[PDB]
Design a protein around this nucleic acid. Structure first.
Ligand SMILES: [Mg+2]
Ligand SMILES: [Mg+2]
Lengths: 209, 219
RNA sequence: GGAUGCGCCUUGAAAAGCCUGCGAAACACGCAGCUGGUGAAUGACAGCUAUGGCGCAUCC
């Protein structure tokens, strides 16, 4: 069984940059190595075959190189259309195996999130449950607590979007879940957000409206 | 010109079975190796199985040997993956792929199907409950909460697809309860809250559900 | 599809085995000739033909 260890796992860069991705086979694979590009929700596309040959129709910015058991994919200068996840693959022996991927993201300037808070709808309230949602809109980079009367941390789950195609920012939601009992028992619902943008901003409502 | 169109995905209980199909166009499968590749949600590509031309020799990943069988009906120009005694970790988008012609692309996989989603879970097909996210600088946010549906996927639009700018639909996350939940939001001029109606359209094809929900300021 | 021309490919290595090129071809199956080189078991080839396959151009 042959392993393909791919680095880096992630990378932020800008248009015009040279990007290099490496993949190291644990045993000889004799340049039976291919590289693929995959955008979110889409099938992978072949870029390089036989370690160093350009697949018919992909731009010449893409190149591949082998040094023994070390394989390198190079993009000469990044274009906006080149941000995506890339994968190496060995097909010397069965089973075939893939590298774990490199996510190429676009670098941009820091941007603080705009925060919003939403109370549970009445239709959900009469249902039995009450969920409170906090939105972090159009921020960068990705890194980013609930208080119901200064009670740190029901539990909550967050979801985050991929980089916006237009302005390269992220958005994030955190949804807090309680029973209808515990919803109608404490005064203020506050979402406090901490980011690389100034001082911990907090947003809140109290069920009286 | 060359195309692979997969079908046969869906929801199955652990221990169950499922047959995926891969319909080829623009070439004859008998002259190529056909592969199946897997991508668990948020995870990398994992090779699953392949079948060789002329001999019909088949090959399988360790994770899968003895449970999956790859085959092909040349008269239908279609390859198949029979998946038996399924496990939760078999949940993934399953891709068909053609190994290209040796002289033209070596052993690279030059054409891929669109992918079909297979989810292995005890939970049962359930439509979602869609709840307004009421609004209230000069722009306002509002949205729709899409809770407790199974399995993936659900699609969300706004005003029958007429509202696009500023929309963010977050990826579904699996709550402890074993069902999915996801919010879709949009930012709009607050000045337009009294004069423009905002409805989110939520389609869940697994349950054949289609919902329209108007989002309004609350009194 | 037929006529004409071009480009790439149509393997090297021999008994077996192993490795490599090719045939729509990782396994199984199949792969012409001559010269020179090489082989006290060694891929190590170079040149020129033959045959066929694909592609391009051009005529019907
Ligand atoms: Mg010869
Ligand atoms: Mg020769």
């Amino acid at each position: 069984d042959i392993q393909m260890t791919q680095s880096p796992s992630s990378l932020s860069a800008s248009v015009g940059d040279r990007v290099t991705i490496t993949c190291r086979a644990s045993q000889s694979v004799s340049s039976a190595v291919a590289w693929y590009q995959q955008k979110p929700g889409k099938a992978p596309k072949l870029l390089i075959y036989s370690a160093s040959s350009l697949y018919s129709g992909v731009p010449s910015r893409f190149s591949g190189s082998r040094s023994g058991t070390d394989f390198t994919l190079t993009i000469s200068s990044l274009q906006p259309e080149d941000f995506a996840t890339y994968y190496c693959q060995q097909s010397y022996s069965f089973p075939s195996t893939f590298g774990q991927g490199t996510k190429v993201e676009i670098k941009r300037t820091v941007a603080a999130p705009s925060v919003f808070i939403f109370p549970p709808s009445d239709e959900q309230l009469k249902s039995g449950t009450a969920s409170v949602v906090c939105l972090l809109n159009n921020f960068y980079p990705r890194e980013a607590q609930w208080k119901v009367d200064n009670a740190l941390q029901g539990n909550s789950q967050e979801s985050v979007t991929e980089q916006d195609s237009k302005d390269s920012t992220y958005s994030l939601s955190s949804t807090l879940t309680l029973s209808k009992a515990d919803y109608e028992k404490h005064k203020v619902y506050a979402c406090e957000v901490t980011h690389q943008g100034s001082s911990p901003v907090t947003k809140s409502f109290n069920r009286g409206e | 010109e060359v195309q692979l169109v997969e079908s046969g995905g869906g929801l199955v209980q652990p221990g169950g079975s499922l047959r995926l199909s891969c319909a080829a166009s623009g070439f004859y499968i008998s002259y190529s190796s056909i592969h199946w590749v897997r991508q668990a949600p948020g995870k990398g590509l994992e090779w699953v199985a392949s079948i060789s031309p002329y001999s019909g020799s088949t090959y399988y990943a360790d994770s899968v040997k003895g449970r999956f069988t790859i085959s092909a009906d040349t008269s239908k120009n279609t390859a198949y993956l029979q998946m038996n005694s399924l496990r939760a970790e078999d949940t993934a988008v399953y891709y068909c792929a053609r190994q290209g012609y040796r002289r033209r692309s070596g052993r690279g996989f030059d054409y891929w199907g669109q992918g079909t989603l297979v989810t292995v879970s005890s939970a049962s097909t359930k439509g979602p409950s869609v709840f307004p996210l009421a609004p209230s600088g000069g722009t306002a946010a509002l949205g729709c909460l899409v809770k407790d549906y199974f399995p993936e996927p659900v699609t969300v639009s706004w005003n029958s697809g007429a509202l696009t700018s500023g929309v963010h639909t977050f990826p579904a996350v699996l709550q402890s309860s074993g069902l999915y939940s996801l919010s879709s939001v949009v930012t709009v001029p607050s000045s337009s809250l009294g004069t423009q109606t905002y409805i989110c359209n939520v389609n869940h094809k697994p349950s054949n559900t289609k919902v329209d929900k108007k989002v309004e300021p609350k009194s």
